[PDB]
Amino acid sequence: PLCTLRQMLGEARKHKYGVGAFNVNNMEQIQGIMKAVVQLKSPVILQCSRGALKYSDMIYLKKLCEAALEKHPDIPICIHLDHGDTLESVKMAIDLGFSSVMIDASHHPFDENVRITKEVVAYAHARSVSVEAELGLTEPQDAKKFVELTGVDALAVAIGLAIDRVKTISDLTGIPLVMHGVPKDVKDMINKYGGKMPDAVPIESIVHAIGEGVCKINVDSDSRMAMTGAIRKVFVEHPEKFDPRDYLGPGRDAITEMLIPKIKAFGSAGHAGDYKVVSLEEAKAWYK
Amino acid sequence: PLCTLRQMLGEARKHKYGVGAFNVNNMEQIQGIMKAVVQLKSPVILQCSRGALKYSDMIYLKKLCEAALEKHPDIPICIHLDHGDTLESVKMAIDLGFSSVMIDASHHPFDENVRITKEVVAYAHARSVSVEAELGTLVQLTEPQDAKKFVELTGVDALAVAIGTSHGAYKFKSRLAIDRVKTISDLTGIPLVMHGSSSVPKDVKDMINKYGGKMPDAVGVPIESIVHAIGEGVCKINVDSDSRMAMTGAIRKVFVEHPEKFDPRDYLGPGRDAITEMLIPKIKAFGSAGHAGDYKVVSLEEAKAWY
Ligand SMILES: [Zn+2]
């Protein structure tokens, strides 16, 4: 059922596991993600940026998310606006039926980040909708003050040695923390088949951080790369094929295969049935 | 609004135009088709084969079609099951909200085709849903007198005819039977459908081959031939390979010119736009442009009275 971020991450915090939050932009991406979380009976957060909403003209993505919610009634599913920039973007998402939003004003000075975030929280909490915010190396007492002044349900913090910082931020704020954004397999495949990926690019570190309070792990690039590597492989190996199902299907399955190990490591496997999901309407009571 | 094939093709037949019926399998393909028909203010048939519904777990495609219906309220849009094989596949499509279904029993002897088709017609007409059937294969070309008898015995709303086309991008080695079309049209009195009608336009094929694809001998139906058939009674023209080639060609181009890109929106976006650009002159040629505002669409519930 549609689930709030507050309830889904509160459960993860209480049982020391993290939930993957996967950016989705079209049908094959949502299908690849849901096959993994359903196979591992894990809750999931589907997230969409304002750009993803533009790409799908808003309505197509809303309807694909309704499809997931209907096809897998027993999986807690949070639909979340990633990297929201303004109250106007938040209103737009809540209107589409989202159950959570991120208001990212972390590039602003502290007081202005608080001002903008507070306004979003008032609007969202009145509808039962959860709010994630960010504060950007983060003094734990500054994190505590920010959460006190704003009332956000979750806090993305600048992470990095200092794992007791994560622990301290989690203990002082008392709320779920979020960790924002590269497999050899995917990387090698893309280059093998014509790609030119940056020389950029550790799971253990993420596991370590979950144990101290990180409850939401954002994954976007990895899925994009899995799909692209799979399509490039079909294009080289079978150049006569032109039906999109012939390369998007393999791309959809690469996403699922790349996600299974991650979900297992984050620890949310098996937890989908742990709690009765609270509706947005019943959630309004949490905020009085 | 959601429209029946009987209404949409009846208008097409009365005014001597044809309506493109485009297979869709996902979001970007629907978006590409809708942008073209909305630009041209034309009717449109979005069709989903049983394979497309498998690919989309049924519900994702049902919801994407709803998104199209909601986003473009004033365009008559028929949601049609392409190449249904059994009454069970037809009940499934109707349950998903479709307004039209094709029952293809053309590979069965005449009497069996008639029997399987009658079963579908009874269930579909009882819900106001239109029915397309096929007599002739694709090589059994359609016999005009037999087509007249089949329609009288089945009551279908539209008949797919066999005149030389076929599915796929390699329809000819380097033709067709359009004289039969007028005769079938006159004898049956109903809208006719032409399957395997992608044209494999030059722009699209050249792009695939320029950027690593291997389709040097792809050949489609010339647009002039389809325009001629429309003038003789063809009202629905099925197009699938052309959209597939357009998307694939555009993705291949991005992959070569910009090997650094790996976000699917960066290549499926250009894919979607290529479908739209490919469809615009085709829709103009079919003659359906500017006709989306011609009639008030009858709901499936009201359409039950027709039967
Ligand atoms: Zn066909």
Side-chain angles (χ1 to χ4, degrees), chain A residues 1-127 129-288, chain B residues 1-127 129-307:
Chain A
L2 181 72
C3 186
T4 61
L5 191 67
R6 184 175 154 160
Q7 176 177 27
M8 178 173 294
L9 299 195
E11 284 278 338
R13 191 173 190 269
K14 173 189 184 179
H15 294 294
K16 295 188 172 180
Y17 61 84
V19 181
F22 307 108
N23 290 76
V24 281
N25 299 283
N26 71 187
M27 183 183 86
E28 288 90 341
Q29 289 181 176
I30 292 153
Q31 286 176 302
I33 288 153
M34 297 305 297
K35 185 181 178 64
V37 297
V38 166
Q39 179 185 311
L40 304 173
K41 312 163 172 313
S42 168
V44 64
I45 295 138
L46 282 16
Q47 51 186 31
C48 318
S49 56
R50 299 164 312 99
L53 288 162
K54 176 181 161 72
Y55 177 81
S56 65
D57 303 309
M58 290 172 57
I59 186 67
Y60 290 100
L61 200 38
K62 172 185 185 189
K63 263 44 174 62
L64 287 173
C65 292
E66 289 178 4
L69 278 38
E70 292 184 13
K71 185 166 162 64
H72 299 299
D74 293 321
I75 296 296
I77 292 179
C78 170
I79 302 299
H80 177 78
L81 171 69
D82 190 22
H83 287 306
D85 65 330
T86 63
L87 174 67
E88 291 73 29
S89 293
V90 163
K91 291 188 178 172
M92 178 269 346
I94 294 186
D95 283 346
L96 293 177
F98 278 44
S99 58
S100 176
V101 295
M102 175 188 198
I103 172 60
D104 174 16
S106 68
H107 50 289
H108 282 103
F110 193 91
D111 288 353
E112 178 74 347
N113 181 181
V114 169
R115 191 189 68 68
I116 292 167
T117 295
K118 271 188 74 166
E119 178 174 43
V120 165
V121 175
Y123 187 93
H125 281 185
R127 297 156 173 83
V129 172
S130 307
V131 178
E132 175 189 325
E134 180 170 350
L135 187 70
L137 305 184
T138 288
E139 169 61 42
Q141 284 294 337
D142 289 347
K144 182 167 182 291
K145 184 187 177 199
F146 184 79
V147 171
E148 286 178 330
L149 299 168
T150 63
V152 294
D153 307 276
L155 185 67
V157 291
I159 291 187
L161 283 183
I163 67 143
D164 70 304
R165 224 189 207 202
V166 175
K167 189 175 177 57
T168 292
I169 290 185
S170 172
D171 294 328
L172 290 184
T173 63
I175 61 169
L177 304 184
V178 186
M179 180 164 241
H180 286 177
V182 174
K184 255 299 83 61
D185 291 33
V186 183
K187 167 60 163 179
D188 299 317
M189 170 166 289
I190 293 174
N191 289 312
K192 186 174 168 167
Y193 299 113
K196 188 161 169 179
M197 298 297 122
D199 357 296
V201 200
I203 191 58
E204 315 50 45
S205 298
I206 291 173
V207 173
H208 194 92
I210 292 167
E212 310 306 349
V214 173
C215 301
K216 181 176 180 269
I217 313 303
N218 287 10
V219 174
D220 184 329
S221 283
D222 283 348
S223 303
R224 289 183 191 185
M225 284 191 195
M227 170 162 273
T228 294
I231 299 170
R232 281 178 117 87
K233 172 172 173 181
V234 172
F235 277 15
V236 164
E237 173 164 346
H238 293 101
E240 72 280 359
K241 283 174 186 169
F242 63 104
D243 184 336
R245 290 184 287 175
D246 283 349
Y247 46 87
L248 265 29
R252 172 174 68 191
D253 288 340
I255 289 169
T256 300
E257 283 321 289
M258 181 271 295
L259 264 35
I260 281 161
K262 285 186 186 303
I263 292 161
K264 293 202 285 201
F266 295 161
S268 60
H271 292 288
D274 289 0
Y275 46 98
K276 183 187 165 53
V277 176
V278 176
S279 70
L280 290 171
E281 182 67 22
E282 309 171 301
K284 289 170 173 170
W286 300 330
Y287 306 113
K288 283 221 177 178
Chain B
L2 181 70
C3 182
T4 56
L5 192 66
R6 180 178 190 103
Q7 180 168 27
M8 186 173 296
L9 302 186
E11 285 279 339
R13 190 175 194 268
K14 184 172 200 304
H15 293 297
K16 297 217 160 215
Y17 59 84
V19 179
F22 306 107
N23 292 71
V24 299
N25 297 283
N26 69 12
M27 183 183 88
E28 291 89 337
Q29 292 181 347
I30 292 163
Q31 288 168 300
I33 291 163
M34 291 311 303
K35 184 182 183 284
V37 295
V38 164
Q39 174 177 135
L40 298 183
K41 305 184 185 316
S42 138
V44 71
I45 291 156
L46 297 178
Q47 45 185 32
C48 314
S49 59
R50 305 197 316 298
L53 290 168
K54 176 159 184 304
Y55 178 76
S56 65
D57 303 307
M58 285 173 293
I59 190 174
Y60 290 101
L61 199 54
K62 171 197 191 175
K63 292 286 196 167
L64 286 167
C65 288
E66 292 185 359
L69 285 155
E70 175 170 350
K71 179 174 174 52
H72 302 299
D74 297 339
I75 299 296
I77 296 167
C78 169
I79 307 299
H80 173 80
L81 173 72
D82 192 20
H83 291 292
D85 68 332
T86 59
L87 166 69
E88 296 66 73
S89 77
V90 158
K91 294 177 189 181
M92 180 265 281
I94 290 172
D95 276 336
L96 291 183
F98 283 36
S99 62
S100 181
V101 302
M102 184 219 177
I103 171 67
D104 179 6
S106 64
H107 298 303
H108 300 211
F110 190 97
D111 296 333
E112 205 66 332
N113 186 353
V114 170
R115 184 177 55 59
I116 290 173
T117 297
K118 282 170 64 66
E119 306 175 18
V120 167
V121 168
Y123 183 94
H125 284 174
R127 295 162 174 75
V129 175
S130 314
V131 177
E132 180 189 315
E134 188 179 315
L135 179 66
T137 56
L138 297 192
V139 175
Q140 223 186 82
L141 293 196
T142 306
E143 278 309 309
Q145 202 56 41
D146 293 347
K148 170 187 180 182
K149 181 172 62 180
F150 184 86
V151 173
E152 297 176 320
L153 292 170
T154 60
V156 293
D157 305 273
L159 184 63
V161 297
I163 61 184
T165 53
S166 53
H167 287 154
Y170 303 91
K171 307 181 195 306
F172 305 100
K173 288 184 160 170
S174 173
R175 299 321 173 190
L176 289 187
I178 55 77
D179 190 5
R180 289 193 173 210
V181 175
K182 181 40 169 177
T183 301
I184 294 156
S185 177
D186 287 346
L187 278 45
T188 62
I190 72 171
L192 302 184
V193 187
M194 208 168 126
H195 283 241
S197 298
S198 289
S199 296
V200 175
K202 250 301 91 60
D203 291 46
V204 169
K205 176 192 180 178
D206 290 347
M207 184 167 301
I208 287 173
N209 297 313
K210 177 181 181 166
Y211 295 100
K214 200 170 198 289
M215 275 162 254
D217 302 303
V219 181
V221 178
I223 190 61
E224 291 173 298
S225 303
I226 291 169
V227 171
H228 192 207
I230 287 172
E232 298 314 317
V234 164
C235 296
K236 174 176 181 275
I237 305 85
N238 290 13
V239 172
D240 179 18
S241 298
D242 285 354
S243 300
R244 288 175 193 193
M245 291 178 65
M247 170 158 281
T248 292
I251 298 171
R252 277 189 170 288
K253 185 173 154 100
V254 178
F255 275 8
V256 174
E257 301 183 326
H258 286 97
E260 75 271 5
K261 298 184 170 188
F262 64 81
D263 181 329
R265 299 175 278 172
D266 294 350
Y267 44 88
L268 259 25
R272 168 180 72 193
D273 291 342
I275 288 170
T276 297
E277 294 314 307
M278 179 271 291
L279 260 26
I280 286 166
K282 183 192 305 294
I283 293 165
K284 293 179 195 271
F286 291 169
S288 67
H291 287 287
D294 289 3
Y295 47 93
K296 171 182 177 72
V297 180
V298 176
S299 72
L300 289 180
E301 182 59 23
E302 308 165 300
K304 288 178 178 171
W306 301 341
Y307 310 112

Short mmCIF file of all heavy atoms in Angstrom, two decimals, chain A residues 45 108 112 128 133 146 189 197 230 249, unseen atoms left out:
data_model
loop_
_atom_site.label_atom_id
_atom_site.label_comp_id
_atom_site.label_asym_id
_atom_site.label_seq_id
_atom_site.Cartn_x
_atom_site.Cartn_y
_atom_site.Cartn_z
N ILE A 45 11.14 2.63 -1.76
CA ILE A 45 10.82 4.02 -1.99
C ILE A 45 11.06 4.24 -3.45
O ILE A 45 12.19 4.10 -3.92
CB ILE A 45 11.76 4.97 -1.17
CG1 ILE A 45 11.53 4.79 0.34
CG2 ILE A 45 11.54 6.41 -1.55
CD1 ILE A 45 12.81 4.76 1.15
N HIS A 108 21.58 26.80 0.76
CA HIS A 108 21.34 28.09 1.41
C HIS A 108 21.96 28.18 2.80
O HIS A 108 22.25 27.16 3.43
CB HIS A 108 19.83 28.32 1.58
CG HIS A 108 19.16 28.76 0.32
ND1 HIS A 108 18.40 27.92 -0.46
CD2 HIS A 108 19.18 29.95 -0.32
CE1 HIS A 108 17.98 28.57 -1.53
NE2 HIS A 108 18.45 29.81 -1.47
N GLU A 112 18.13 30.45 6.12
CA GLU A 112 17.26 30.40 4.96
C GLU A 112 16.87 28.93 4.66
O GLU A 112 15.78 28.67 4.19
CB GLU A 112 17.95 31.01 3.74
CG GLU A 112 17.07 30.94 2.49
CD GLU A 112 15.91 31.94 2.49
OE1 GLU A 112 15.59 32.53 3.54
OE2 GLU A 112 15.29 32.10 1.42
N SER A 128 -0.40 14.92 5.94
CA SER A 128 0.12 13.63 6.38
C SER A 128 1.36 13.19 5.65
O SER A 128 1.92 12.13 5.93
N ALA A 133 14.79 16.67 4.52
CA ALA A 133 15.50 17.93 4.22
C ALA A 133 16.98 17.64 4.33
O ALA A 133 17.35 16.50 4.64
CB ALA A 133 15.10 19.09 5.18
N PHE A 146 18.52 22.13 13.67
CA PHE A 146 17.78 22.21 12.42
C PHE A 146 16.50 21.37 12.49
O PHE A 146 15.45 21.82 12.05
CB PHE A 146 18.64 21.67 11.29
CG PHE A 146 18.00 21.79 9.96
CD1 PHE A 146 18.00 23.00 9.29
CD2 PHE A 146 17.35 20.69 9.37
CE1 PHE A 146 17.35 23.13 8.04
CE2 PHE A 146 16.71 20.80 8.13
CZ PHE A 146 16.73 22.04 7.48
N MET A 189 30.97 -3.61 -18.87
CA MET A 189 30.07 -3.85 -19.97
C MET A 189 29.87 -2.60 -20.82
O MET A 189 29.92 -2.65 -22.05
CB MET A 189 28.74 -4.32 -19.43
CG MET A 189 27.67 -4.37 -20.46
SD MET A 189 26.32 -5.28 -19.80
CE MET A 189 27.05 -6.97 -19.79
N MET A 197 32.52 5.78 -20.04
CA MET A 197 32.20 6.17 -18.69
C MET A 197 33.38 6.80 -17.96
O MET A 197 34.52 6.36 -18.13
CB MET A 197 31.74 4.96 -17.88
CG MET A 197 30.47 4.30 -18.39
SD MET A 197 29.02 5.40 -18.31
CE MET A 197 28.50 5.40 -20.07
N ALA A 230 23.30 -2.96 -20.79
CA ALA A 230 22.53 -4.05 -21.42
C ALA A 230 22.07 -3.70 -22.85
O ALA A 230 22.08 -4.53 -23.75
CB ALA A 230 21.34 -4.43 -20.55
N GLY A 249 13.99 -4.86 -22.49
CA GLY A 249 13.67 -5.95 -21.60
C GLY A 249 14.97 -6.40 -20.93
O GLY A 249 14.99 -6.61 -19.72
#
